[model samples]
Target: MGHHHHHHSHMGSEEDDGVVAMIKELLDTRIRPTVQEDGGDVIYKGFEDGIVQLKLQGSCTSCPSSIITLKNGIQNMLQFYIPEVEGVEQVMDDESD
Candidate 1:
């Protein structure tokens, strides 16, 4: 008998170093504190093709109001500071069974 596991190995794409750093800085310094105070935190997953991927943790994961937070609050803030950011989206972690 033989056991084998196959996985998807996606090639990494180059990101704008300056923009990515700015996004992180703004999130940490400005955005995250407010969300944390509300018992949630926004996590940076990746940025691609002008889309910023984020993960909402804690209470935000289940809160219906989180969409407004992502769109009106987070996206608007990021877009204001970084023109490279066209949109922000919530992404869930990939789980294996």
Candidate 2:
């Protein structure tokens, strides 16, 4: 049996305007390069309710330790740099087969 796709629909907020920009900048500069070194890439989907939504691509899609990389590595760094980032959640594209 095929697994069902879980959909998460949340309203985007404009209140944390500076927070969003800072998150994107940090993701591009500090985070992405490290992931790219392992032949994987992390995409910033959106930020809502203190959670930073991200999408993993390339090798990360099938990697065994992706969760560790997400929660332990990415989440840790994000929270460290940006206190507003309460956590990181991995999200998949709805169009994925």
Candidate 3:
């Protein structure tokens, strides 16, 4: 008797492109607008391994509560709608340093 090699199925990287685009759209239509109103904006850097990298700009850059915004508002919102987003991390501007 021969053994059957059953391989586990995993979603290809391309499968999540739609998720990334959807997240960007949410940022554009819902989140970014609010931040921009306060003279700040967020950029979608990249999505991988369920972690989303974002670049905070304008007032958001120097905002004292940027971390709170990232953790409480943005991260909570994203995690609420998109179950795929496991975590959110802010990408600091090179010029900031």
Top model number, TM-score: 1
Candidate 3 least-lDDT 10 residues: 6-15
TM-scores, in order shown?
0.76, 0.75, 0.73
Q: How displaced is residue 56 in candidate 1, in Å?
A: 0.4
**lDDT per residue as tens, model 3, 14-51:** 44778877878888998889888978888887777888
Better of 1 and 2 by TM-score: 1
lDDT of 2 by residue, 19-86 (tens): 87777888899878977896877888888888988888767667768766655677777788788888
Descending-TM-score candidate ranking:
1, 2, 3
User: Which pairs of residues have clashing backbones in candidate 2?
Assistant: none
Instruction: Supply the TM-score for candidate 1.
Output: 0.76
Question: Which runs in model 1 stand beyond 4 Å of their true positions?
Answer: 1-14, 94-97
